[PDB]
Amino acid sequence: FYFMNQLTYGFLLMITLLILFSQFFLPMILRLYVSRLFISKL
Amino acid sequence: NDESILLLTFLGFTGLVAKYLAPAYKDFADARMKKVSDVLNASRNKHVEAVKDR
Amino acid sequence: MQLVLAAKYIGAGISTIGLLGAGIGIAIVFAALINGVSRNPSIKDTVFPMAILGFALSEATGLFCLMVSFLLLF
Amino acid sequence: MQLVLAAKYIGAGISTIGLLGAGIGIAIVFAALINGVSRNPSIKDTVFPMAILGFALSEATGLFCLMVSFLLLF
Amino acid sequence: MQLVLAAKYIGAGISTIGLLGAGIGIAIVFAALINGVSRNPSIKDTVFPMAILGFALSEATGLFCLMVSFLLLF
Amino acid sequence: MQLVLAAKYIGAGISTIGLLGAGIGIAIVFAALINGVSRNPSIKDTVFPMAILGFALSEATGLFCLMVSFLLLF
Amino acid sequence: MQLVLAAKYIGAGISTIGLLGAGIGIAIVFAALINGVSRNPSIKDTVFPMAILGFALSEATGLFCLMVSFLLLFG
Amino acid sequence: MQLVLAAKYIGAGISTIGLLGAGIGIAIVFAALINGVSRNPSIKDTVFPMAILGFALSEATGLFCLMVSFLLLFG
Amino acid sequence: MQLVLAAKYIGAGISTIGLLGAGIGIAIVFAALINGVSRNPSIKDTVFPMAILGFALSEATGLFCLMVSFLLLF
Amino acid sequence: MQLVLAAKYIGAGISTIGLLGAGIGIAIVFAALINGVSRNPSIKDTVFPMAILGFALSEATGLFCLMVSFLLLF
Amino acid sequence: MQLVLAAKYIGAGISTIGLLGAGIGIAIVFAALINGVSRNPSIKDTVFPMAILGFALSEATGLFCLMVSFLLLF
Amino acid sequence: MQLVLAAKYIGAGISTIGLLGAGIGIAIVFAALINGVSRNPSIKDTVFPMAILGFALSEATGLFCLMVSFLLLF
Amino acid sequence: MLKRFPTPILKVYWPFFVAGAAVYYGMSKAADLSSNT
Amino acid sequence: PNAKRIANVVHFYKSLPQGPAPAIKANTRLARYKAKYFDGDNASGKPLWHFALGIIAFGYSMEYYFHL
Amino acid sequence: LTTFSLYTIIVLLVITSLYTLTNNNNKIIGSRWLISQEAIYDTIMNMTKGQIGGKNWGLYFPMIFTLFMFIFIANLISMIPYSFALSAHLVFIISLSIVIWLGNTILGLYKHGWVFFSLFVPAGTPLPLVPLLVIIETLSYFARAISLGLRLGSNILAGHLLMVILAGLTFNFMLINLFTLVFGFVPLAMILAIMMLEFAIGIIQGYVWAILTASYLKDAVYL
Amino acid sequence: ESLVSKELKDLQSTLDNIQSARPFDELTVDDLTKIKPEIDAKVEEMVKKGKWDVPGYKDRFGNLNVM
């Protein structure tokens, strides 16, 4: 059978998508939170 | 097509969120973006009262 | 026309295991009847008619169960 | 002619689980009996007209516990 | 050659086991009622017809498990 | 007889599974007794004879059960 | 090949034991309805429809067994 | 003629299968005792015989089938 | 060829009855829900996620059955 | 010669379903203990011998479901 | 010769009936959670690591009815 | 000849209905722990060892699933 | 476009970086010639 | 005291005064995704609906190319 | 060429271009097609707070987020009908789940090591308690791996397997007559009543994966 | 005595920058980084420590969750 073939980029898709979150797409809203803090306490 | 029913079985599931769950999220979030867009503004008017004392 | 005479005998007898539903359902209708009249003795005739409704509800399933043995036995 | 009709005393063993959960059936009104009359001791003479006379109303189902057994036995 | 029409009588008598599902089932709703209005006898005119909805909806799976027993007739 | 009358030993093995409901009714009328004497200790020796008939009445299915198990022995 | 059409005939009655979960599953959810509203009649319409959504999943298990028998029925 | 002796082999398997009734029944009486003496210790020597009376009387479904089921070995 | 395939069908029928517990498993996680809503009507905002992950663990574990039977159907 | 131990391997599993009663019978003995002692944590000192003489006789049937299953060993 | 390959998976097909040990085995624990938090709300984050420690020891203990199928399927 | 291991495969696979109570034995002991600690949060230090005590005396025999199934398949 | 940030990835997911190579190589003992029935 | 009253005197003053320069005149197939349906006016179930109406075409075609 | 990775590059295309349509060129207001993304953001912020809680808390937070949004958009293939799914390809899920089972244990190696034998009982124990229950709880450890990924892979393929068996039933119920459309309307929205719950299962199967992975690295990380 | 007397317009120029110069809800975020770079400096220090839960958010704003 061919169990190997999708798995080669299966979890390889994971380690590139985490870095899009952990470094790019997740923390872009945390700046959007703290900007709502430095407009809160001014 | 023998499987003609297949795209048809969300004729009304697509209509469910269009008729029964369109304001259940769009008229849920609008007050929330209303909530942020003035509680910064009203606290900003509190800055216009805090600058008046000095 | 041999072994079909056996299957109308064995399959007839398994049908009465389904009468467990009529047996147990005719039990909780009274097992919840009387603890109700225990707390409230005076108010009784509001449920004694609907209990035999609940009994007729339970026995309708068992009487729509067992007669399938004698459905086409002869 | 010998291996088919012999099944009438084979499927007659399977009907012993007809409603013979008396513990699921018959006993649970007697549980609800001494549940209720230990709450009101002065009510036990009006619950025997609806429990043990209600018991046969539950065992109207239990009449045919094994009537389908012996009828195809002897 | 007799076997396909022989399984018509074991293939339905085993299919009527799950008619106990409404059997113990449909009385549980009634087993909720008669101690339900024990603690509150007043509100019964609206909560009893909603229990008939539960009576009828679980009776629908009191005829499904005999539906394929009557598919024997076709 | 080796294929006809020798078959009845497995009809007994399904006859002796009917006592699973018997073992509960000689348990749960005992189970409502000990909690029945909990919240009222001075109802003890009037309920204790009205409950031991529940040991006799519920096991009447447990004793009418395996008569068909010993119908084939003796 | 009349044994396989006996094999697609014997198995519907052995696949309908699993209905009995749904026979009582819709009732024990209904069991908590009537004593649910007995503690407060002002809860009557905020617990009615959600336990029907709590009911509806229990039917699909019983609607998982009939399609097995019917795929066992039709060929 | 060991076909029926093979049936008495498997028929020994469904012989004393019925110990579920004496398996949960022998515990549910103690489920009532241990919740009974929990709520009040002033029945510690009254029902402790009467649940012992519940104990041996619950095993009447226990050792009943066994007297020919353990004795089908030698005869 | 169809003498070995004849037991693939009878497996896939007898296999899918272990998810009768999938119904009632997906039931007492709602029957124990509205006892919470009736006894504390201001807790529905936080008790709903405790049972919405409650039954998804349950009814998928009952759904392990037809994952086996579809292997023995197809 | 293919019936040396023909029906011996099948029966030893179908006999071993008695661990259901040995399973939850091994459970309520502690399950009723823990919410029992949650009513009163001072009674724990006297049920430390009652979980001795409550559990050991509860799994008296636990030896009685495997020695029947040990028809094959010796 | 290969006629017993059918007996390999009908012995595996019936092994999915052992999944109600996780079908109900995690229903009532979550049904013991979602009322046990409603009786007092601010013990949400203490009984919830208690439940997962009780969840995984119950459904994974009911999971290895899957392994007796899979090593029988393969 | 060939029919030996066929007779082992439907006996070893039918032993895994035996663990059914062993699954839902874990449920009720973890049920009344999170119902027993729910009203007394100051008891998890003392009775949570009593809850896990209900395995090492209980599932030490209650989990004999593959110990009766694959054992004579050496 | 977006902003990059020095977020801690290797010193805290190094088991999961290693474990990705652990199961990949396990198929080199399983999908070499054992998949030709 | 004085410190919060001087932590604001830059950022209240040095920012944009009008909310001008709307930047909707930046259309080079980079921002033309959002000026059609992602403006803050309609809010129906539209951008999800035209996602599915392509993948069912992408689904039905790949067997029309394979076998049909 | 590759005939089974056709839509795997779509799965990160929806989130490498999620900033294209959610973030309205970096407004602080956060309009309606963005405020769900912060609504879905705090729904993982809350749950891994309440059952980890310690100081070393948010370090694994991106990994437990990127497991959610990876299988939350598994629902796309369960509703696009003319597709053989990727969550139905359960060989990858059950082998994605093998690394998160041992990966916490190898996270327990250099952090904890010799003390990691303390999975026996987190409470007090006498002599005969521990050495025969340790196999009962490690039965929840060497089968902890298979119990997670199979649960996702078995609930979701019935989104096209418990429904495509109906398509052989209702299309056979229409090509009989024109007066065969009797007994009400059973080959209709009754099937639609079946589909949307498995569609809604597809949401909560992702959410249950966030909770399940969160509980396992609570004790594999904390003492 | 008149040390703060030449501070007679630095808060008055802000008051004229508030009565008709308040675009607080149509402006973006990255302009404020050009205004205040320290709002990204504590971002850097709260990422490496793993502090994503910004304190001082729940007292003024909701959780926006499905709890």
> D47 contacts in C (CB within 8 Å)?
34, 37-38
Q: Residue D39 and residue C41: Cα distance in Å, rounded?
A: 11
Output Rg (C-alpha) for chain N, integer angstroms. 24
**Surface of O (113-172) touching A: CB under 8 A:** none
Region at M32 (left for phi over 0; alpha for psi -120 to 50; beta for the rest): alpha
B4-11: long-range pairs with CB below 8 Å, 24+: B4/O171, B5/O167, B5/O170, B5/O171, B6/O81, B6/O82, B6/O167, B7/N56, B7/O81, B7/O82, B9/O81, B9/O163, B9/O191, B9/O192, B9/O195, B10/O79, B10/O192, B10/O195
What is the chain N residue with the closest CA to P31?
N15
Which stretches within B1-54 are classed as H helix? Answer: 13-19, 23-50
DSSP letters spanning chain G: --SHHHHHHHTSTTSSGGGHHHHHHHHHHHHHHHHHHTS-GGGTTTSHHHHHHHHHHHHHHHHHHHHHHHHHH--
Q: In chain F, what residues touch H14 (CB-CB under 8 Å)?
A: 10, 13-14, 16-17
For the stretch B7-11, contacts whose Cβ atoms lie closer than 8 Å and that sit 24 or more positions apart, written own/partner, are B7/N56, B7/O81, B7/O82, B9/O81, B9/O163, B9/O191, B9/O192, B9/O195, B10/O79, B10/O192, B10/O195
Among candidate residues N47, O197, G55, the one with its CA nearest the CA of residue B16: O197
Write the burial class of residue E38 (CB in 10 Å: 0-12 exposed, 13-18 middle, 19+ buried).
buried
Tell me whether O51 touches chain P (CB under 8 Å).
no
* Residues 39-78 in O contacting M (C-alpha not used; CB under 8 Å): 59-60, 62-63
List of chain O residues whose C-beta atoms are within 8 Å of the C-beta of residue G67:
162, 165-166, 169
C3, containing H or E segment: none
| N5, N15, N50: best to mutate for the B interface, most B CBs within 10 A | N5
Nearest CA in chain P to O61: P50
> Are I24 and G24 inside 8 Å of each other by CB?
yes
Q: Tell me whether L24 touches chain K (CB under 8 Å).
A: yes
Residues I38, G57: C-beta atoms closer than 8 Å: no
Contact status of M5 with chain A (Cβ, < 8 Å): yes
Helix (H, G, I), strand (E, B) or coil at O220: coil
Q: Is L57 on the interface with J (CB under 8 A)?
A: yes
Q: Which chains touch C (3 or more CB pairs under 8 A)?
A: D, E
CA angle L31, L34, L37 (to 5 degrees): 135
Best residue of A30, A32, A42 to probe chain P, by most P CBs closer than 10 Å = A30
Contacts of F16 in chain H (CB under 8 A): 14-18, 65, 69
In angstroms, the CA H43 to CA F38 distance is 8
What sign does the CA torsion over K31, K33, K36, K40 have? negative
Q: How far is CA I54 from CA G58, H9, I47, M17, O3, in A?
A: 14, 44, 10, 32, 38
Chain C residue with minimum CA distance to D44: C38
Closest to L26 (Cβ–Cβ): which among K18, K36, K57? Answer: K57
Reduce the DSSP state of residue K62 to 3 states and report it.
coil
CA O112 to chain centroid, in Å, comes to 28
Decide if I40 contacts K40 (C-beta within 8 A): no
Please judge whether K30 and I58 are an interchain contact, meaning their C-beta atoms are less than 8 angstroms apart.
yes
Strand spans (E) along chain D: none
Buried b (16+ CB within 10 A) or exposed e, L18-53: bbbbbbbbbbbbbbbbbbbbbebeebbeebbbbbbb
Contact A30, O79 (CB under 8 A): no
The domains found in chain F, sorted by start residue, are 2-74 (1.20.20.10)
- Residue H15's alpha-carbon distances to D6, F11, F68, H68, in angstroms, are 21, 11, 14, 9
What's the farthest any 2 CA atoms get from each other in chain N?
78
Residue N3 C-alpha, separation from nearest chain O C-alpha, in angstroms: 26
Two tokens, residue O7:
């839509």
Residues of E in contact with C26 (CB under 8 A): 27
- O166 interfaces chain G, CB cutoff of 8 Å: yes
- CA distances to A41, L54, N5, P9 from N2, in Å: 14, 66, 5, 16
The chains found to touch E (3+ Cβ pairs under 8 angstroms) are: C, G
Tokens of N35: 């000026």
| Shortest alpha-carbon distance between residue O198 and chain P (Å) | 20
Q: Is E66 on the interface with C (CB under 8 A)?
A: yes
The answer to whether the CB atoms of A24 and M9 lie below 8 A apart is no
Q: At a CB cut-off of 8 Å and minimum separation 6, what does C72 contact?
A: C8
Resolution of this model in Å is 4.2
CB pair distance less than 8 Å for P24 and B41: yes
K-chain residue closest to I42, CA distance? K38
How far is C-alpha H72 from the geometric centre of its chain's CA atoms? Answer: 20
User: Are residues N9 and P15 in contact, defined by beta-carbon separation less than 8 angstroms?
Assistant: no
Which residues are within 8 A (CB) of F12 and not within 5 positions of it... i.e. 6 or more apart?
Answer: D13, F69, F72, F73, H11
Q: How far is A26 from chain P (nearest CA, A)?
A: 10
Distances in Å between the alpha carbon of N16 and those of I7, J15, P23? 79, 84, 7
Short-list A11, O73, O11, CA closest to M16: A11
Contacts of residue G72, defined as CB under 8 A and 6 or more positions apart, other chains included, come to: G8, G11, G12, G15, I9, I12, I13
Domain count along chain O: 1
Q: How far apart are CA O201 and CA I53, in angstroms?
A: 11
Can you tell me the distance from the alpha carbon of F59 to that of G54, in angstroms, rounded to the nearest whole number?
A: 39
Q: How many CB pairs under 8 A join E and G?
A: 125
Judge: N34–O20 Cβ closer than 8 Å, yes or no: yes
Look up residue D55 and give its two tokens: 């018991």
Contact E2/E66 with Cβ under 8 angstroms? no
Chains N and P touch (3+ CB pairs under 8 A): yes
Answer whether K73 touches I (CB < 8 Å): yes
How far is L16 from chain O, CA to nearest CA, in Å? 16
Residue with tokens 């029902």: H47
Tell me which amino acid residue O98 is: I
Other beta carbons less than 10 A from residue E59's beta carbon: 19
- In 3D space, the residue among O160, B43, B45 whose CA is nearest the CA of residue A38 turns out to be B43
Cα separation, O145 vs K56, whole angstroms: 11
The kind and range of the H/E element at F25 are helix F22-25
Give residue for tokens 């309205």: O24
User: What residues in O contact N47, CB-CB < 8 Å?
Assistant: 21, 33
Q: Is O201 on the interface with B (CB under 8 A)?
A: no
CB atoms within 10 A of CB J69: 22
Q: Which residue of A has its CA nearest to M17?
A: A15
Q: Do the beta carbons of residue F38 and residue H36 sit within 8 Å?
A: yes
In Å, how far is K68's CA from the nearest CA of chain I?
A: 11
The chains found to touch O (3+ Cβ pairs under 8 angstroms) are: A, B, G, I, K, L, M, N, P
Residues written for chain N: 68
Note whether D35 contacts F: Cβ–Cβ < 8 A. yes
- Residues with Cβ within 8 Å of F56's Cβ and at least 6 positions away in sequence, in order, are none
In Å, the largest CA–CA distance within chain H is 63
Instruction: Tell me which residue of D63, D23, C20, H24 sits closest to F54, measured CA to CA.
Output: D23
Whether C15 sits inside 8 A of E11 (CB atoms) is: no
The answer to whether residue O29 neighbours chain B at the CB level (below 8 Å) is yes
K18 in contact with chain I, both atoms CB, cutoff 8 A: yes
User: Rounded to an integer, what distance in angstroms lies between the CA atom of residue C54 and that of residue K35?
Assistant: 29
Residue from C2, C20, C53, C65 to probe the interface with D (highest D Cβ count within 10 Å): C20
- Provide the residue ranges of all domains of chain A, joining segments of one domain with +: 1-42
Q: CA of B18, closest CA in chain P: separation in Å?
A: 21
- The angle subtended at Cα O142 by Cα O138 and Cα O145, nearest 5°, is 130
Closest CA to K19 of G25, G65, L21, J23: L21
What is the residue extent of each domain of chain N? 37-64
Determine contact: A37 vs chain N, CB below 8 A.
no
CA D16 – CA F72 distance, rounded (Å): 14
DSSP secondary structure letter of residue D2: -
Smallest Cα distance from O44 to chain L, Å: 25
